[PDB]
Swiss-Prot record, chain B:
Its EC number is 3.1.26.4. It is found in: Cytoplasm. Keywords: Cytoplasm, Endonuclease, Hydrolase, Magnesium, Manganese, Metal-binding, Nuclease. Pfam families: RNase_HII (PF01351). The keyword Cytoplasm applies. NCBIfam families: ribonuclease HII. It comes from the Archaea. Its cofactor is Mn(2+); Mg(2+). This is Ribonuclease HII. The keyword Cell membrane does not apply. The gene is rnhB. Manganese or magnesium. Binds 1 divalent metal ion per monomer in the absence of substrate. May bind a second metal ion after substrate binding. GO terms for biological process: DNA replication, removal of RNA primer; mismatch repair. InterPro entries: RNase_H2_suA (IPR004649), RNase_HII/HIII (IPR001352), RNase_HII/HIII_dom (IPR024567), RNase_HII_arc (IPR020787), RNase_HII_hlx-loop-hlx_cap_dom (IPR023160), RNaseH-like_sf (IPR012337), RNaseH_sf (IPR036397).
Amino acid sequence: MIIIGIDEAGRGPVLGPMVVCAFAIEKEREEELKKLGVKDSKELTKNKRAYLKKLLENLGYVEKRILEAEEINQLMNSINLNDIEINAFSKVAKNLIEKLNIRDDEIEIYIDACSTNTKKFEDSFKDKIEDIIKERNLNIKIIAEHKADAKYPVVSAASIIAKAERDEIIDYYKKIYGDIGSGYPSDPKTIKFLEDYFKKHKKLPDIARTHWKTCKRILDKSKQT
Amino acid sequence: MIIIGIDEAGRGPVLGPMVVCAFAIEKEREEELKKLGVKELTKNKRAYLKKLLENLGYVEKRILEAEEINQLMNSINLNDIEINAFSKVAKNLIEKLNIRDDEIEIYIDACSTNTKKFEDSFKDKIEDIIKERNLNIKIIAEHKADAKYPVVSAASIIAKAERDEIIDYYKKIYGDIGSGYPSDPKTIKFLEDYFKKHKKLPDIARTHWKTCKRILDKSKQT
């Protein structure tokens, strides 16, 4: 059977994209994945993650979904972040199952619940893919839990790939905006970037997520007085 | 017996490092190597094969950055450098693996024009370390050996992958530098551009290559 891990990267920053990745492989090639050393701590450097991605992509089937801040802002005009995650996680799952044309077999999906309601996340996920599962006569096993990229290899692979992809996009933003920092408000470089940018253009830059506190607060303040 | 393949990457470019690699494996386990079908590929699949290969056999590597190349060429030529680097990785394998009272077959991918002479110089280089190891050493060098012998294809795959890691990274400190060869207008460009702005050649440029020697002569300084 096929074993699939799904995770995401970039959920926390006030800027940049979110990347959702599903990583699938034959359960029989599982020892091969472990040997690749994905069983590493989440303390990897950007360079090491980039290296690992190359090996991982050669080993399994990789489905990716990149949501730039502009799409995230648009979607959030109607649905919240948790819905976006549920939708994106289910979409890469269904897309990977359809592209590999998996059917009439067992299948296992491991997902990393990055939000506060693990059970809600898993139940929503299964509700989204139930149609395709039954339609394809698949006998699925779904497992959702926090910090899953720390315990299930395929989820670890999905995580590393999603973060490496995000790193690539962010690296090029620097050529457009300069040193934008880590993307978190704990970094003066990121605060300086957004504040200085807004002061000059009277609008947030295209990569800013309008619904994150840091950015909303900047907008709320511009409207005072 | 022990089978060893020796190849290199980056012999021709006007920039970047030269990588020499020697891959060794027990002949009894050679099928574990052929099973990989080592005898072009993406930089992804190659990086993958390199990891599998370094786990499969004994891999000895020598990386010569342009700076070292330039310094060495102030006294010896490129063919001489290859004799030294190729013989050195072979001596290290023999010594580190402590091979003795055994048969060894060394396959060399030889780019130089006079292969038999390269072979003799190589042989002359390892004479001292093998004299008292009671080894039956068979040396075979030829052009395009990486297309004929699995152990040589392995070394070639590894050396190219090593060179790519270094070169692909440079593309972030200099931007698109081209292929490293003169044909690539971005290579012959990146050099001229750096020279006009810096008044010197970039550190990764090989000073003795025609393109670089020419750039240096135009200013008529040297």
